[PDB]
């Protein structure tokens, strides 16, 4: 899928997307989601 193998994607039921990077070990509401559409 359009997800990079280094990236980890989940969306919260609140309607917010947070990608956890196993690289840096951080969660990202700062998403390729809003960065796209």
């Amino acid at each position: 899928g359009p997800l990079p193998p280094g990236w980890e994607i989940r969306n919260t039921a609140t309607g917010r997307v947070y990608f956890v990077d196993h690289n840096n070990r951080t969660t990202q509401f700062t998403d390729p989601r809003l960065s796209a559409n």
Partner: peptide
């Protein structure tokens, strides 16, 4: 993050 404080870093956070 410009959005509200996100889920604590668990690999697969259940929400």
């Amino acid at each position: 993050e410009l959005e509200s404080p996100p889920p604590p870093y668990s690999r697969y956070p259940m929400d």
